[PDB]
Design a binder for this molecule. Structure first.
Ligand SMILES: Cc1c[nH]c(=O)c(C)n1
Ligand SMILES: Cc1c[nH]c(=O)c(C)n1
Lengths: 215, 217
């Protein structure tokens, strides 16, 4: 049994978090998440789905559920880049971690979500050492660097697949790469993975980002 | 008071986290942090300090406690890059965020700590990247990085397992390579060139606790 002292940690652990059941119906949300999502008491999340929150995030409720079902059917954990206008009238950006929620004998009974606010050197063989992209180009590049395929990028940005190939070709040539693989390596070796394009921060989207341990 | 579902969620939330009192005595640690730190029964953390965990991390316990005291005294949140050997026999890198812990009436009674495994998305959150004509060697980039984040020469020596004189050597090699005339101008030029977002890849197997950012809330 937990002391009240330890329960205050439960109440004050920073971030935007909670859990849903197998139908992605909310079971708990901490106060920070409830306020974010437009509610004065986070208890009003319980029993509702992502479609039913008074918040523009509900326009991506179908993406949230597909994410949730992936964690549930596979047991893998995912990292989601979430960028949305919110009931407070501001755009926010988060990485939401999603992991399976397990019961007392270990079986998956839902998902846990945990969100955090998102607030010219070259790599050499050993060490480091020492081109102007379009808004559209830098958006396509950022998504390609995190493992997203062209049909993924077409959906996120709301353009045709052929158009993503258009921007991919410019990038490949702007970096002087002879293939998409070389484009990725060259861009990574120049710090392109560590910056979110500022125009991407005003495009509503929910996309899983490929994630790897370092090293 | 908590329901069975809220207790279950509390026990499965990701990360390696817990809280400490005003003297950084542990009051709670989740299972993930217990296991990482060598205490498979995580309530064994309670009432210990960082000096008393069964873990090579304790060599940096004085630095952990200086970070905790900063959060307590200022009310700021800090993010720390933490690289250490661990009782499982491996090196682990993490970002640890430290937040004031407050009582029923709002005053600070300690700190909350929350660690993430160093991953692609995790470094993105802190705006740094890792490498998988002005040229820097492996050891020079390590020195330069530790210089950018406030480490004194004797601290740098400890991280790199060498002597201060050796460290002075690399520091002068960087001052002439950047054309800077002092350590001040060297930090300024390297920052001006965007070295403030690089973590040299060879630091992932050297022991260090380094504050990356400090935030008002
Ligand atoms: C804002 C947000 C994104 N994805 C989610 O699943 C949840 C619960 N909230
Ligand atoms: C491993 C580790 C790093 N820094 C800390 O303060 C804590 C609580 N643990």
């Amino acid at each position: 049994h937990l002391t009240l002292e330890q329960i205050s940690l439960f109440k004050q652990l920073p971030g935007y978090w909670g859990c849903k059941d197998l139908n992605s119906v909310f079971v708990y949300a901490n106060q920070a998440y409830g306020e974010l999502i437009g509610l004065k008491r986070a208890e009003d999340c319980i029993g509702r789905t992502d479609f039913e929150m008074p918040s523009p995030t509900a326009a991506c409720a179908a993406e949230f559920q597909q994410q949730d079902r992936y964690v549930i059917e596979t047991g893998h954990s995912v990292k989601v880049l979430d960028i949305h206008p919110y009931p407070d009238g501001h755009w926010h950006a988060h990485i939401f971690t999603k992991t399976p929620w397990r019961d007392s004998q270990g079986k998956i009974q839902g998902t846990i979500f945990f969100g955090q606010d998102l607030t010219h050197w070259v790599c050499r063989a050993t060490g480091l050492s020492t081109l102007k992209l379009t808004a559209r180009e830098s958006e396509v590049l950022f998504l390609l660097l995190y493992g997203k395929k062209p049909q993924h990028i077409a959906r996120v940005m709301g353009i045709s697949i052929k158009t993503v190939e258009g921007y991919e070709a410019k990038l490949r040539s702007k970096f002087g790469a002879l293939s998409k693989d070389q484009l990725i390596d060259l861009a990574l070796d120049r710090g392109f993975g560590s910056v979110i394009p500022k125009t991407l921060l005003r495009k509503q989207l929910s996309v899983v980002l490929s994630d790897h341990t370092i090293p």
